[PDB]
Paper text:
The fusobacterial trimeric autotransporter adhesin (TAA) CbpF binds to CEACAM1 on immune cells, resulting in downregulation of their activity against tumors colonized by F. nucleatum. In contrast to Fap2, CbpF is a homotrimeric type Vc autotransporter protein, in which all three protomers together form a trimeric passenger domain that remains exposed on the cell surface after expression, and a C-terminal β-barrel domain that serves as a membrane anchor. The ECD of CEACAM1 comprises an N-terminal, membrane-distal immunoglobulin variable region-like (IgV-like) domain and three membrane-proximal immunoglobulin constant region-like (IgC2-like) domains IgC2-like A1, IgC2-like B, and IgC2-like A2. CbpF binds to CEACAM1 via a protruding loop (D142–Y149) and via H92 on the respective adjacent protomer chain.
We therefore formed the complex of nanodisc-reconstituted CbpF and CEACAM1-ECD (residues 35–428, ACRO Biosystems) and removed excess of CEACAM1 by preparative size exclusion chromatography (SEC). We then vitrified the SEC fraction corresponding to the main peak and resolved the structure of the complex to 2.7 Å, applying C3 symmetry. The structure revealed a heterohexameric complex in which one CEACAM1 is bound per CbpF protomer, with the N-terminal IgV-like domain of CEACAM1 and the region around the β roll protruding loop of CbpF forming the interface. Each CEACAM1 protrudes perpendicularly from the central CbpF trimer and sits atop the β roll protruding loop of CbpF. Four residues of the eight-residue long loop 142–149, i.e., E142, N144, Q146, and Q148, form H-bonds with side chains of T90, Q78 [Q44 in mature chain (11)], and Y68 of CEACAM1. In addition, there are two further H-bonds three β strands “above” in the stack that are formed between H92 and N99 of CbpF and the backbone of S127 and D128 of CEACAM1. Importantly, H92 originates from the neighboring CbpF protomer, and both together form one CEACAM1 interface. Instead, a tight interface is formed exclusively by the peptide moieties predominantly via H-bonds, whereas only two hydrophobic surface-exposed residues (F63 and L129 in CEACAM1) are buried in the complex. The rest of the CEACAM1 side of the interface appears slightly negatively charged, whereas at the CbpF side of the interface, positive charges dominate. Our CbpF/CEACAM1 complex structure shows that CEACAM1-F63 is in close proximity to H92 and F143, which probably form aromatic stacking interactions.
Author numbering:
A (entry chain D), B (entry chain E), C (entry chain F): 35 to 234
D (entry chain A), E (entry chain B), F (entry chain C): 26 to 274
Write the structure that this text describes.
Amino acid sequence: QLTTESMPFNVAEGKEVLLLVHNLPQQLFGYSWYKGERVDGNRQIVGYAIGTQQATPGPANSGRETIYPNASLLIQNVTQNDTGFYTLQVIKSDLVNEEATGQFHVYPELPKPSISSNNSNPVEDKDAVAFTCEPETQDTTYLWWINNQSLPVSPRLQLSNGNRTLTLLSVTRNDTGPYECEIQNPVSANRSDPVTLNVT
Amino acid sequence: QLTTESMPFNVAEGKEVLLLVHNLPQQLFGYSWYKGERVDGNRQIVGYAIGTQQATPGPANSGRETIYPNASLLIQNVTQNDTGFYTLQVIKSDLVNEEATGQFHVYPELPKPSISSNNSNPVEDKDAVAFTCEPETQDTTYLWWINNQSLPVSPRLQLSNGNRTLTLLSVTRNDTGPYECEIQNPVSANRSDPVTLNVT
Amino acid sequence: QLTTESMPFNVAEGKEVLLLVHNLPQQLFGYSWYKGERVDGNRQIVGYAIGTQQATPGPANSGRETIYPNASLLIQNVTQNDTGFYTLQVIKSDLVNEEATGQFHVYPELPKPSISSNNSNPVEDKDAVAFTCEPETQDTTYLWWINNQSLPVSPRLQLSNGNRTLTLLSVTRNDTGPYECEIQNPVSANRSDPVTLNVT
Amino acid sequence: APVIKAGTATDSTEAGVDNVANGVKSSAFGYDNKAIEKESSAFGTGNRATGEFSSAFGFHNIASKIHSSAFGSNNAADGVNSSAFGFKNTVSGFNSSAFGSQYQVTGNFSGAFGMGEFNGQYQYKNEGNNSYMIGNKNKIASGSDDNFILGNNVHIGGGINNSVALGNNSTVSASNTVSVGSSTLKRKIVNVGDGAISANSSDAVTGRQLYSGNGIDTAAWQNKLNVTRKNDYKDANDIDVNKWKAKLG
Amino acid sequence: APVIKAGTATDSTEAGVDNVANGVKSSAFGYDNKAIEKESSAFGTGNRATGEFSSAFGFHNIASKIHSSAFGSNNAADGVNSSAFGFKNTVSGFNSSAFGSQYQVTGNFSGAFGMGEFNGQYQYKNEGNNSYMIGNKNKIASGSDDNFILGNNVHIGGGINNSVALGNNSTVSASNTVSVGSSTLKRKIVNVGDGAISANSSDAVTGRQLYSGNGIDTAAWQNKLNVTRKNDYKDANDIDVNKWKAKLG
Amino acid sequence: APVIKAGTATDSTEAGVDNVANGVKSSAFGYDNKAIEKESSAFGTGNRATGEFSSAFGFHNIASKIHSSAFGSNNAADGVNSSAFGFKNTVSGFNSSAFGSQYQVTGNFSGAFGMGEFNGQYQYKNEGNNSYMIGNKNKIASGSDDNFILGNNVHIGGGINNSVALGNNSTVSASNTVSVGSSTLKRKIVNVGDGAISANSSDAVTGRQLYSGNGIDTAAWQNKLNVTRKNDYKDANDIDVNKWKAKLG
Ligand SMILES: *[C@@H]1O[C@H](CO)[C@@H](O)[C@H](O)[C@H]1NC(C)=O
Ligand SMILES: *[C@@H]1O[C@H](CO)[C@@H](O)[C@H](O)[C@H]1NC(C)=O
Ligand SMILES: *[C@@H]1O[C@H](CO)[C@@H](O)[C@H](O)[C@H]1NC(C)=O
Ligand SMILES: *[C@@H]1O[C@H](CO)[C@@H](O)[C@H](O)[C@H]1NC(C)=O
Ligand SMILES: *[C@@H]1O[C@H](CO)[C@@H](O)[C@H](O)[C@H]1NC(C)=O
Ligand SMILES: *[C@@H]1O[C@H](CO)[C@@H](O)[C@H](O)[C@H]1NC(C)=O
Ligand SMILES: *[C@@H]1O[C@H](CO)[C@@H](O)[C@H](O)[C@H]1NC(C)=O
Ligand SMILES: *[C@@H]1O[C@H](CO)[C@@H](O)[C@H](O)[C@H]1NC(C)=O
Ligand SMILES: *[C@@H]1O[C@H](CO)[C@@H](O)[C@H](O)[C@H]1NC(C)=O
Ligand SMILES: *[C@@H]1O[C@H](CO)[C@@H](O)[C@H](O)[C@H]1NC(C)=O
Ligand SMILES: *[C@@H]1O[C@H](CO)[C@@H](O)[C@H](O)[C@H]1NC(C)=O
Ligand SMILES: *[C@@H]1O[C@H](CO)[C@@H](O)[C@H](O)[C@H]1NC(C)=O
Ligand SMILES: *[C@@H]1O[C@H](CO)[C@@H](O)[C@H](O)[C@H]1NC(C)=O
Ligand SMILES: *[C@@H]1O[C@H](CO)[C@@H](O)[C@H](O)[C@H]1NC(C)=O
Ligand SMILES: *[C@@H]1O[C@H](CO)[C@@H](O)[C@H](O)[C@H]1NC(C)=O
Ligand SMILES: *[C@@H]1O[C@H](CO)[C@@H](O)[C@H](O)[C@H]1NC(C)=O
Ligand SMILES: *[C@@H]1O[C@H](CO)[C@@H](O)[C@H](O)[C@H]1NC(C)=O
Ligand SMILES: *[C@@H]1O[C@H](CO)[C@@H](O)[C@H](O)[C@H]1NC(C)=O
C-alpha cells in the first residue's frame, strides 16, 4: 500500500515542507504530484520519468516545488494558500496507475499580543473588571497566566467570546498580580506583557 | 434497395436533368457517380465524402455536373452525347459498397418540317400523287392531318418509307383540303405549313 | 543440401579462384559470403539481393571479390593471406538462413632450386659426399634425379633434413652422372641445373 | 483453463481466459480482452475495443471510435479514423495518426512521428490542425495550424500558422516562415543552386552570386550609391563650371 | 458457436466462426477470416491473406503478395514487401509503405504518411518512384520520381524529378529545386548562418551579409558599376586633357 | 489438430498447433508461437515474445524488451519501448521506432521511415542518437547525433551533428548546416519571401533584393568600393590642388 507523510504536518509560513513516500512499488515508470484530491492534468505540479531521468514541471508549478528520485516532494517558500490535499500518482512498469494522498496545514507567525481592561481602577471592595487580548487572529488557542501560574479554574473567573475575554466577577485587593495572556497555534507561541492590578 | 430515378426521363438538348436517389442507407461514408454501367476509376464523374463534407470532381467530369448531399446528381447543358447509363456507388459506414443504376435519353429540338408533292396539278378524275415531309430526322414519329382532322385509315391512303411518305392512290376533287404533317419525339412537337390541293 | 566447391582447390599466388555453389534453393532472398568458418557482420565480403538485384561489398571486401547472380564468388589476384575457410549464407524466401562452407589453399610459385656439395673432389675409392638443395621453402616436396632416372631406393642413398640432404655413403667412379634436384608443390614444379661428380 | 465460446451477441467469439465480447460479429482473443461494439476485435492482453469497426491489437490498447486502430503497447486511439501505433500513443483528433513512443495528437488531420514524454501526463502534444511533427519532444500549441516540424525540442506557440521548422533545437517565432535554427544556433544552407537575379525573381542568391554581382541592376545601384561613372568623369559630364574654376583657377 | 478446428491444409488453424484456412501452416482467427496461402495469417474481422508469408490484422484487411502487412482498418497491401498501416491505405508498389488514412501509393520504393481522400476512389495518390509524402492531400503524378513533400495540398505534375516541397500549400514547378511556397504565398527563411562569400562557394547569403557586403569582389563590382575610385579622383588618373581644358579653360 | 489449452503458467493460453506460452497472463495464438515472458503476446506464425509486456504480431516477429512491438514480417524489436513495424525492421535502440522495409535503427531515441537493404546484413542503418531518416538507402554513422534526413542515398559520416539533408542524393559534410544537394547536383530554393536587410538580420535574401539593392548600407558600401559621390565630384570636394593644377595647367 502506498502512503505519503508530510514532514512536518504543520509548517510556519515561509518555511519548507517535505512529503515522504513509503512502500513505493518495485518496478516503476514515473511519478506525478497533483494539487487537490483529484488527479487532473491541469493540477499537475511536477512529474518524474525514471526512464529518461527527467523532472518536468507541470502547469500548476510555481517554481517552489522539486521532485526527488525517491518520489519525495519538497515545497519551499510555503504560503497560507498552499494548505490543502496533495495526491501522488505512481505509474508501475505495466503502466497501471497507483494513487496516494497527503496533506499539511500552513499557519502564520503569531505575533506579540496585548491586553486591555475597560476599568483602569478596580474598586477594592468589589468590581466586575474584564480582561481581553485585542489582536484577533484566526484558529488560535487562548490561555491566561496569573501570578506567573496557570489560572485556577473557578466560576469567579468568567470567560466570554470563547475564552479570549477574561471577566473577574468580584475582585479583591488580594488578587493584585501580573495579568498576561497567550495566543497559540500548532506552530508557534510567545507571550504578551504582564498587566498589573491597581488598588490601594 | 437502392434505386435511382431520372427527372425527367427524356430531356431536350441544352436543358438539365436531375437524378434522384431513394432508400439511401442510414450510415454512409460517401458517394460516387460513374458514367456507364461499370464502376471504373476512369469513368468517375464526381464523388462526395460525408466525413469531411467535400465534393471532388472526377476524371470524367466536364464542369456541368454537381453532386448534392442527398446523393443527387445534376447535369446542366445536357447534350446528345450524354445519353447512356449512369451508376451510383454508395459506400456505407463499414465501407461495403452498394450499387445502383439510372439512365436518361437526350433528344433534339425538332423544327418546323416541310412537305413536297411530286405532282403539282393533280388530275381531277384520278391521280396517284404522293405527299412527303422532306426534313429527315432520326427516331421521330410522323402523323398526317387533313382538313385539320386525323387521317381516316383506308387502303386508299398509302404510306411508304415507313409513313413519312403519304401517297393518294386515287384522288378526287372532293378531297381538296389543307395537307399538313407533324414530327414528334418524346420531348417536343410542332407543325409545318398547311398544303392545299389544286383542282378546277 | 547446400555445398560449395573451390575451383581450383590450390591456386598459385596472383591467380584467381572461383567458388561454385550447388543445390541452390529454388526460392531465394539473397546471398552473402563471409571470411572464416563463422557468420559475422564484420567478416562479410560481399552480398547480393535478388529483389533489387544489387551487389553490395561488405566491410571485409578488398576490391578483388565479385558475386555472381548464381551465388558464385570470384576472387582475383589471390594472395597467401587469403588461405582459409569461407562460408556462404543463403536466405530463402521465408528468410530462414542456410549456411555452407568452402576453402582453398594458396601456394607460392617456386623457382629454380640449386644444389650444393661439401666436397668438390670425391675420392674415387670411397667417400661420403653429401648433396643438398639449399633454397629452403615451406610445405613442398623434394625429389632427386640421377642419370635422368629416379633415384634407386637403397640404404646407400642416405637422406637428411627430411630428404633435402642426400648423402652418398661410399662413392664409386661408376656413380658419375648428372645430379638434379626437384622442388614441387601442389600448384607448380620446375627443376634445377644438373650437377656432376669429378673423378679420374 | 482457456476456453472457446460464444459471446453475448450473434457471431461473437471469446478465445482465452476472462474475455468479454458483446458486439455483433465481435471477437476477443487473448487474456482480459473486451470487444463491446459491432465488428470490433481485441487481440492480445487487456485490450479494449469500445467503438464500431475498431481494433486494438497488442497490450493494454484502447480503441473508442468508428474506425480506430491501437496497435502496440498502451495506445489509446480515441478519434474517428484515427490510428495510434507504437508505445503509449494517444490520438484524440479526427483522421489523425501517431507513430512512436509517448506522443499525443489532439489536433484534427494531424500527425506525429517520434518520441515525446509521459511522466504522469503527456508533456509534448500536437494540438494543431493539419500539422505534422517528426522528431523528439516537439510541441504545437492549440490554434497554431498548418505547421510542420523536422527536428527536436521545437515548441510552437499560439498564433503561428504556415510555418516549417528544420533541425535540432530550431525555433519558430512568426507565421509564413521557414526556420533553420534558433537565435543561439544558426545553420548554414549549403549546396544551393545559383539564383535568378532579376526584377521579380523570388530565389535564394548564393555566395558566388553576391561575390561577383552578375545581373544586378547597374542603373538602380548607381543611384542608391552616388557613383561617378568613368565616362562622365573622363568627359566632364555633370559638373559645375562657375566654382570648379574657383578652386582650380 | 465458435469452434477450433483444422483447415484444409497441414497445420492450418481456424479459430472463431465462419473461418477458412487453406495454406500450409496458415491460420485464420476471428470472424469471416480467410488465409489461403502458405504461412499466411488473418486475425480480426473479415480479413483476407492471399499471399505467402502475408498477414492481415484488423478489420477488412487484404494482403496479396509475398510479404504483405495490412494492419488497421480496410487496408489493402498489394505489393511485394509492402506495408499498409492505418485506415483505408492501399499500397500497390514494390517495397513501398503507407501510414495514415485514405492514402494510395502506386510507386516503387515510395511512401506516404498523412491523410488523403477516398470518396469512391483515391483522389490523392503517390505514383512516383523513390518519393515520399508527409502531409495532407498531396499528389505526385506518374513519371515524377525522387520527389519529397513536407506539407499539405502539394500537387506535383509530370516530369518533375529531384524536387522538395516544404510547407502548407507549397508549389513545385521545375526539377532540381526546393520550394518553400507558391506564387501567392512566399515564405521567409529565418535563422540562417552567414554565407561563405567567395569565387566558388554555393551558400545562402543573409540580410547582414548583403547589408554590409563584406568579402565582395571589390574589383569585379568596380567594372560592372563604372566606379571612379577616390584614388584616381585624388591623383587625376585617366582623364582627357584636350577635353577638360575646353570646359575648364 | 489445433487445440486450446493452458500454457505452463497461470492464465497462459495456447491456441493453434505447436504453441508455447510460459509467462503469467501470456498467450500464443497461431502456429509455432512462443510467449515466454509475463503478459507477452505472440499472434501469427512463428512469432517470439521474449520480453515482458511485449507483443509480436505477424510472421516471424521477435520482441525482446520491456515494451516491444514487432508488427509485420520478420521484424525484430530489441529495445526498451521500441517499435518495429513493416517488413524486416530491426530496432536495437532505446525508445526508437522504425517503419518501412529492411531498415535498422541502433541509435537511441532515433527513427527511420523508408526502405534500406538487407542482403545478409543490414547495409543501411541509423547509428545516431536523436536522429531521424525518411527516404531510401540512407546512412548515419555512429557518433553523429541530432541529424535529420529527407532524401535518398544520403550517407552521414562520423562527427557530424545538428545537420539536415534534403532531397535525393544530398550530401552532408559539416555540422550545423542544412544541405539541399551535393557538389555535383545543386538545388535552387524558389518562392522565398523577401529578406530583412539590416545590420543584424539573419534571413535569406532573394533575387529581387540583390537585383535592386534596396536597404543596403549606402555608407559602408561606399568605403569598400572607393566611389566618388556626385555630391563631391560636382562640387570639387576632396581634391588635390597642387597636382590638379599641374596636369590641368
Ligand atoms: C528522498 O530524497 C531526500 C533527499 O535525499 C531525502 O531527504 C528523503 O529522506 C528521501 N525519502 C526517503 C523515504 O528516504
Ligand atoms: C519567499 O516568499 C516571498 C514572497 O514571494 C519572497 O519575497 C521571498 O523572496 C521568498 N524567499 C525565497 C528564498 O524564495
Ligand atoms: C514572537 O513575538 C514576536 C513579536 O510579535 C513575533 O514577531 C514572532 O513571530 C514571535 N515568534 C514566535 C515563535 O512566536
Ligand atoms: C468593565 O469592568 C467593569 C467593572 O465594574 C464591569 O462592570 C463591566 O462589566 C466591564 N465591561 C465589559 C464590556 O466587560
Ligand atoms: C514564570 O516566569 C518565567 C518568565 O518570566 C516563565 O518562563 C516561567 O515559565 C514562569 N513559571 C512557570 C512555572 O511556568
Ligand atoms: C480556552 O478555549 C479552548 C476552546 O477550544 C478550550 O479548549 C480551552 O479549554 C479553553 N480554556 C479555558 C481555561 O477555558
Ligand atoms: C436533393 O437536393 C436537391 C436540392 O436541394 C433537391 O432538389 C432534391 O429534391 C433532393 N433529393 C431528394 C430525394 O430529396
Ligand atoms: C451550353 O453549351 C453550349 C456549347 O458548349 C455553350 O455554347 C453554351 O454557352 C452553354 N450555356 C451555359 C449556360 O452553360
Ligand atoms: C418548334 O420549331 C422550332 C424551329 O423550327 C424549333 O426550334 C423548336 O424546337 C420547336 N419547338 C417544339 C416544342 O417542338
Ligand atoms: C408522282 O405523281 C403521280 C400522279 O399520278 C404518281 O403516278 C406517281 O406515283 C408519283 N411518283 C412518286 C415517286 O411518288
Ligand atoms: C383545328 O384548328 C386549329 C388549327 O388552326 C388546331 O389548333 C386545332 O387543334 C384543330 N382541331 C383539332 C381537333 O385538332
Ligand atoms: C406511323 O409509323 C409508326 C411506326 O412505329 C407507327 O407506330 C404508326 O402507327 C404509324 N401511323 C400510321 C397512320 O400508319
Ligand atoms: C556462376 O556465374 C558465373 C558467370 O556466368 C559463371 O562463370 C559460373 O560458371 C556460374 N556457376 C555455375 C555453377 O553455373
Ligand atoms: C595484384 O596485387 C599486386 C600488389 O597489390 C599489384 O601490384 C597488382 O597490380 C595486382 N594485379 C591486378 C591485375 O590487379
Ligand atoms: C619456374 O621457376 C621460376 C623462377 O625460377 C618461377 O618464376 C616459376 O613460377 C616457376 N614455374 C613453375 C611451373 O614451377
Ligand atoms: C661431408 O662429405 C664428407 C665426405 O667424406 C663426409 O665425411 C661428411 O659426412 C659430409 N659432412 C656433411 C655435414 O655433409
Ligand atoms: C630425360 O631428359 C629430359 C630432359 O633432358 C626430361 O624432360 C625427360 O623427362 C627425362 N626422362 C625421364 C624418364 O625423366
Ligand atoms: C621425400 O620427402 C617426403 C616427406 O613426406 C616423403 O613423403 C618422400 O617419400 C620422400 N622421398 C624419399 C625417396 O624418401
